[PDB]
Design a protein around this nucleic acid. Structure first.
Ligand SMILES: Cc1cn([C@H]2C=C[C@@H](COP(=O)(O)OP(=O)(O)OP(=O)(O)O)O2)c(=O)[nH]c1=O
Ligand SMILES: [Mg+2]
Ligand SMILES: [Mg+2]
Lengths: 412, 555
DNA sequence: AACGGCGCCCGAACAGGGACTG
DNA sequence: CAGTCCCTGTTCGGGCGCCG
C-alpha cells in the first residue's frame, strides 16, 4: 500500500556487473537458508540469465554474535546511484555526535524490508548464490523490497524513520540520532546506566512498529590522536641525527616552519654511523623549536564535504598500526594509532581488517562518510581472507599500495 | 500453429537502436547440403522449426560439423552478428566441477539429455529474429526459409538459457529427494545416492520420467549404469578417479603451436600427476610471434620434457572427498620459481595435485612465492570443497615468524605446520636493525646523464676509502644499485651503507633472493656473503653527512 | 568457420611515483 | 611549477588445455 519511490541510475552508467566470488561451505549453507526464508516472505524472487546485472553476496557475524547475517557488496551499485542518496534525499550529519560521551550503533536494516522497491529498479539488485564444487549453477535472486547495504534504502525510508523517531526525540531533546546505511547512531552524554536504559526505550519504540537486540557501544569523547613526536635521547649518534633530519625533512611537507640547518651542521664530514655527536647549543634550540611546531595545529586544515575521504594505514609491527585521514595530501584531518587488536602478534589480515572497520566507524561518526583506504597489503592476499574477518554491515572502497618504510614517520 | 512446450520461456531482448542480422550465406560443399535439408524437415514436423516467408527481412548463414565419436552430425548457427546486437546475459556457470570434490556414493548414474538446446523453447517475440534460408541445390532452387522455435546452437544466449531452464525443472525433484546428489553441468547429469542398486534405478527412472514431462529425453545411448563412468573427461570408479588417457605428441621438429598444445596438456595433466614442470617449455614461447616457426628444444627444455614423460608412464589416480576427515595440503619447492603441491586426507591418497610457477615482480624471494602458492591453493580449495586445508610447508616456524613480523606489508598464512623435506625455504640474508659498531661506513651514490646515458657511481667511507667508476649506457637507478654493489664488493664481512636512493633501498629491504636484473642478483650474492649489513637512508641534496661528499664525486 | 565456462603463460597497452631538467 | 624518463605494477585479450 506504498507507492514505490522512483530510483534512477546516474546518467550514462549501466548497472553493476560484478562476478560472485567463491564462498565457504558454512557461508553458502547460511545464505541458502536466509534466501529461502526471504523468498517465502516475498523479500526476494528468483530470476534468470536475462538480467545482465549481478552483485556479490556473502555472510558475516557481528562482534560477539553467532547468527549469520546476509551481506551484499553493493559498492558498485552505490556509486552508480550517487545522485540519489546525496542530492535528492540526503541525510544531514550532526556535528555533535562525535562530542557525545557514549554512542550506540543499532542495526535497523531489517526495517527496510517493509517498503517495496521500484519495479524498474529491482533488476539492479540481482545477486547470485554459488554452489560448492559447481554442483548446481548459480541461484540468482533479485530484491523486491529495499535491500540492506544499499545507500538508497535509508534515503527512501528516511521519511518513515523520522515519524518513528519523532516521539523519542521530543521525549529526549538532548539525544543525537544519526542514520548511516543499515545502522542507527544514538549518542548521549548520560551515564552508562542512563544511556543503555534510554537505548532500550528506543528499541521498544521500534518494536511497536533480527539484530535489534545488539548494541555496539562507542566513546568518541575518548578518541585520541597520534601526533608526530620526536625521540628524546641522552646521547645522539650520527645514525640518530641522520634519521632525525630525514624525519624532519619529510615533516616539512606538513609544517613549513621546521628547520634542519643546525642539525645538519652536526653531520659535517664523513663520520661513522655509531659515532656519538654531542648536540651544540644551536642544535638544542632548533630541535626544541621543532618539537613545539609539531604540537601546533597545521594551518588551513578543514573538512570539505564535497571531497572524498582518504585513509592510509601503516604496519608498524608488534601489533601497532598507524593511520591518517585526509582529503588533500599533507592536510590530515585525523591521525591515529591502533594497538593490541584482535589477531595481534599472529594475524596481519585480521588486524588490518579490524583497523579498516575502526577507521570507517570513526569517519561515519565524525563526517558521515566512508573513506577510500590505501591498504598496505597485496591484492591477492587481502581478497583471499578479508571476508573471513569482516564484521560490519557496510563495505568501504579500497586500493592496494606498497610503500617501504624509508623513514618511520608516525611511530618511532 | 505450433504447440507451446511445458518449459517456461525466457524473455530475450536486443540492444536498443539495432535491428536483426542481415548476412549473406556461405557457399559450402554439397556434402553439407545433403546433411541439413533432412534436419530442417525433421525439426519442422517435430515443431522445433517453423517456416517463414517474405515478411522476415533477416538472414543468417549456418554450417555443420561431425560430432566427436558419433555418426550423427552437429548443426551450428554462426550468430556472430546476432551476438553483437543481442542483449548481454549473466552466465550462471561459475566454474567446472572437479571429481576430487565428489563424495563417496554407493550408486552412481550418468545421464545425458538428447537434443539439449533443441528441447528448450525460444522467446515468443524473439523467434522472428532468427531467420535463415536453406538451398536444396547450390545454385538452383531458391529454397524456403525457416526460423527457430528453440535454442540454436551457436547463439551466445543458448547456454545460459538451457542451464537456467534445466535447474527450474530439477528444483521440484530435488525437493522431493533431498538425499540424492545431482551434479548438473550443461546437459550431462551426474546422479548419485547411497541407496541400494535396486532402489537407485527406481529413482533414476522416476527422474527420467520427471524430465520427460518437459520434453527432455534421456536416451539409452548415453546412459551409464556401471563404472567406469566417463564424466567431465575423467574415469569415475567406485573408490577412485583418474583423468582420461592423455596423449602427448612426439614430433621430430618442434614448432610454436606444437609447444602451446604441449604445455596445455601438461597443465591439464598437473591436476593428478605430481611434479610436472612447464617453465623451460614455456620459456621457448617468448619473443617469437610466428605460430608456424620451428623452435629447437634447448637442453633444459628437453630434460624437462623427458622428465614429464616418465611421470605420465606410471598410472596415477585420485580419491574422493570425505567430509569427516581433514583437508591436508603439502607444498614442495621444485626450484627456479616452481612449486608443486598435493591435497589429500589420508597419507599418499591424493585428492588432486597442482603447481604454482608464476613469477610476479622483478624481484622476489622464496617466502613471497610460497605465500602466493598458499593463496592459490586456498582459493582453489574453497571452490572445490568450500574450506581451507591445513598446510604442511617446507619452512621453519621461526623463518616465517621473522619474515611476516618484520615485513612492512600485511601478510599471513592459514593454520599450517612445518614439514622437514628439503629444499627448505629460508631467508638468505637479514638486514640489521641498528648500525654496526666497528664496521666501515660507506656513503654510496650514483648519477647518470639523461642524454648521453653516461654516469658515475662510487662511495666514500669514514676511514678514507673512496672509489668512483665511470659507467656507459646506464640510468640513475642503475648507478645507485652499482654504488651499493661497489660498497659490498670493497667492504669487510660487516658494513654500514648509507644511500639516498629510495629505489635501491626498496628493492633490498624486501630481502629478494632472485631477480630478473643481473645487477641485483650480484648484490644479493654479496649480501649473502656478508655477516652484518646495515642499510640507512638519508634525503638527497641536503648536505647530510658523507652523502654530500660522495654526491660531488658522482656529479 | 559457432557459443558459454574455468585454468595456465604470453605480450602490448596503460597507470603511477621518484627524480631530473626547462 | 610542467614534462619527460625510468621502473614496476596491473589489466586484458589471445594462445593452449579441458568441459558441454
Ligand atoms: C559439444 C557442444 C555442445 N554444445 C551444447 C549443445 C548441447 C549441449 C550438449 O551437447 P551434446 O550432448 O554433445 O549434444 P546434444 O545436443 O545434447 O545431443 P545428444 O548427442 O546428446 O543426443 O551443449 C554446444 O553448443 N557446442 C558444442 O560443441
Ligand atoms: Mg546431450
Ligand atoms: Mg643519490
Amino acid at each position: 500500500p506504498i507507492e514505490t519511490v522512483p530510483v534512477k541510475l546516474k546518467p550514462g552508467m549501466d548497472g553493476p556487473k560484478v562476478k560472485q566470488w567463491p564462498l565457504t561451505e558454512e557461508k553458502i549453507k547460511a545464505l541458502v537458508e536466509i534466501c529461502t526464508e526471504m523468498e517465502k516472505e516475498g523479500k526476494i524472487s528468483k530470476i534468470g540469465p536475462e538480467n545482465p546485472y549481478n552483485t556479490p553476496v556473502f555472510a558475516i557475524k557481528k562482534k560477539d554474535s553467532t547468527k549469520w547475517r546476509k551481506l551484499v557488496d553493493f559498492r558498485e551499485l552505490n556509486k552508480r546511484t550517487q545522485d540519489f542518496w546525496e542530492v535528492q534525499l540526503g541525510i544531514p550529519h550532526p556535528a555533535g555526535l562525535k562530542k557525545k560521551k557514549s554512542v550506540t550503533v543499532l542495526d535497523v536494516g531489517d526495517a527496510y524490508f517493509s517498503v517495496p522497491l521500484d519495479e524498474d529498479f529491482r533488476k539492479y539488485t540481482a545477486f547470485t548464490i554459488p554452489s560448492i564444487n559447481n554442483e548446481t549453477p548459480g541461484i540468482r535472486y533479485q530484491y523486491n523490497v529495499l535491500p540492506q547495504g544499499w545507500k538508497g534504502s535509508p534515503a527512501i525510508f528516511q521519511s518513515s524513520m523520522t515519524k518513528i523517531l519523532e516521539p523519542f526525540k521530543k521525549q529526549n531533546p538532548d539525544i543525537v540520532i544519526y542514520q548511516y546505511m543499515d545502522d542507527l547512531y544514538v549518542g548521549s552524554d548520560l551515564e552508562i546506566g542512563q544511556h543503555r536504559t534510554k537505548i532500550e526505550e528506543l528499541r521498544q519504540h521500534l518494536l511497536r512498529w533480527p539484530f535489534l537486540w545488539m548494541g555496539y557501544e562507542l566513546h568518541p569523547d575518548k578518541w585520541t590522536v597520534q601526533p608526530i613526536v620526536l625521540p628524546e635521547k641522552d646521547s645522539w649518534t650520527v645514525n640518530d641525527i641522520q634519521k632525525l633530519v630525514g624525519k624532519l625533512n619529510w615533516a616539512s611537507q606538513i609544517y613549513p616552519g621546521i628547520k634542519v640547518r643546525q642539525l645538519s651542521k652536526l653531520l659535517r664530514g664523513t663520520k661513522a654511523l655509531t659515532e656519538v655527536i654531542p648536540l651544540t647549543e644551536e642544535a638544542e634550540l632548533e630541535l626544541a623549536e621543532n618539537r613545539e611546531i609539531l604540537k601546533e595545529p597545521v594551518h588551513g586544515v578543514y573538512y570539505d564535504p564535497s571531497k572524498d575521504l582518504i585513509a592510509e594505514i601503516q604496519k608498524q609491527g608488534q601489533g601497532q598500526w598507524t593511520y591518517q585521514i585526509y582529503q588533500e595530501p599533507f592536510k590530515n584531518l585525523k591521525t591515529g594509532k591502533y594497538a593490541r587488536m584482535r589477531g595481534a602478534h599472529t594475524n596481519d589480515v585480521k588486524q588490518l581488517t579490524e583497523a579498516v572497520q575502526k577507521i570507517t566507524t570513526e569517519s561515519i561518526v565524525i563526517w558521515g562518510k566512508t573513506p577510500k583506504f590505501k591498504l598496505p597489503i597485496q591484492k591477492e592476499t587481502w581478497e583471499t581472507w578479508w571476508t573471513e574477518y569482516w564484521q560490519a554491515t557496510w563495505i568501504p572502497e579500497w586500493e592496494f599500495v606498497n610503500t617501504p618504510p624509508l623513514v618511520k614517520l608516525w611511530y618511532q | 500453429m505450433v504447440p507451446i512446450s511445458p518449459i517456461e520461456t525466457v524473455p530475450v531482448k536486443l540492444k536498443p537502436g539495432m535491428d536483426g542480422p542481415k548476412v549473406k550465406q556461405w557457399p559450402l560443399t554439397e556434402e553439407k547440403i545433403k546433411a541439413l535439408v533432412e534436419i530442417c524437415t525433421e525439426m519442422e514436423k517435430e515443431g522445433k522449426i517453423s517456416k517463414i516467408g517474405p515478411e522476415n527481412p533477416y538472414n543468417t548463414p549456418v554450417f555443420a560439423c561431425k560430432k566427436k565419436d558419433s555418426t550423427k552430425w552437429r548443426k551450428l548457427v554462426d550468430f556472430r552478428e546476432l551476438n553483437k546486437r543481442t542483449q548481454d546475459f549473466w552466465e550462471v556457470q561459475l566454474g567446472i566441477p572437479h571429481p576430487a570434490g565428489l563424495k563417496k556414493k554407493k550408486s552412481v548414474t550418468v545421464l545425458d539429455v538428447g537434443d539439449a538446446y533443441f528441447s528448450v523453447p525460444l522467446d515468443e517475440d524473439f523467434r522472428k529474429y532468427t531467420a535463415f534460408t536453406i538451398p536444396s541445390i547450390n545454385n538452383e532452387t531458391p529454397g524456403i526459409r525457416y526460423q527457430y522455435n528453440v535454442l540454436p546452437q551457436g547463439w551466445k544466449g543458448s547456454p545460459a538459457i538451457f542451464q537456467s531452464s534445466m535447474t527450474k525443472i530439477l528444483e521440484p525433484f530435488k525437493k522431493q529427494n533431498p538425499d540424492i546428489v545431482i551434479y548438473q553441468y550443461m546437459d550431462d547429469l551426474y546422479v548419485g545416492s547411497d541407496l541400494e542398486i535396486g532402489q537407485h534405478r527406481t529413482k533414476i527412472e522416476e527422474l527420467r520420467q520427471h524430465l520427460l514431462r518437459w520434453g527432455l529425453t534421456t536416451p539409452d545411448k548415453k546412459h551409464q549404469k556401471e563404472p567406469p563412468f566417463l564424466w567431465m573427461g575423467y574415469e569415475l570408479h567406485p573408490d577412485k578417479w583418474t583423468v582420461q588417457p592423455i596423449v602427448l605428441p612426439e614430433k621430430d621438429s618442434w614448432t610454436v603451436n606444437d609447444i602451446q598444445k604441449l604445455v596445455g596438456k601438461l597443465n591439464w595433466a598437473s591436476q593428478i600427476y605430481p611434479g610436472i614442470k612447464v617453465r623451460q617449455l614455456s620459456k621457448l614461447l617468448r619473443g617469437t610471434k610466428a605460430l608456424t616457426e620451428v623452435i629447437p628444444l634447448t637442453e633444459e627444455a628437453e630434460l624437462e620434457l623427458a622428465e614429464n614423460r616418465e611421470i605420465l608412464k606410471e598410472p596415477v589416480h585420485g580419491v574422493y572427498y570425505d567430509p569427516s576427515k581433514d583437508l591436508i595440503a603439502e607444498i614442495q619447492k621444485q626450484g627456479q620459481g616452481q612449486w608443486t603441491y598435493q591435497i589429500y586426507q589420508e597419507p599418499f591418497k591424493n585428492l588432486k595435485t597442482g603447481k604454482y610457477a608464476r613469477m610476479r615482480g622483478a624481484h622476489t624471494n622464496d617466502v613471497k612465492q610460497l605465500t602466493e602458492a598458499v593463496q592459490k591453493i586456498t582459493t582453489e580449495s574453497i571452490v572445490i570443497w568450500g574450506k581451507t586445508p591445513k598446510f604442511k610447508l617446507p619452512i621453519q616456524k621461526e623463518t616465517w615468524e621473522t619474515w611476516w613480523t618484520e615485513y612492512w606489508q600485511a601478510t599471513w598464512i592459514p593454520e599450517w605446520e612445518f614439514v622437514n623435506t628439503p629444499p627448505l625455504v629460508k631467508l638468505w640474508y637479514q638486514l640489521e636493525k641498528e648500525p654496526i659498531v666497528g664496521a666501515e661506513t660507506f656513503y654510496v651514490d650514483g648519477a647518470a646523464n639523461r642524454e648521453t646515458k653516461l654516469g658515475k657511481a662510487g662511495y666514500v667511507t669514514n676511514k678514507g676509502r673512496q672509489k668512483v667508476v665511470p659507467l656507459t649506457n646506464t640510468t640513475n637507478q642503475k648507478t645507485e644499485l652499482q654504488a651499493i654493489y661497489l660498497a659490498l664488493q670493497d667492504s669487510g664481512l660487516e658494513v654500514n651503507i648509507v644511500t639516498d636512493s629510495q629505489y635501491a633501498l626498496g628493492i633490498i629491504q624486501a630481502q629478494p633472493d632472485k631477480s630478473e636484473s643481473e645487477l641485483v642478483n650480484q648484490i644479493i650474492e654479496q649480501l649473502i656473503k656478508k655477516e652484518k649489513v646495515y642499510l640507512a637512508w638519508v634525503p638527497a641534496h641536503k648536505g647530510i653527512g658523507g652523502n654530500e661528499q660522495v654526491d660531488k664525486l658522482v656529479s
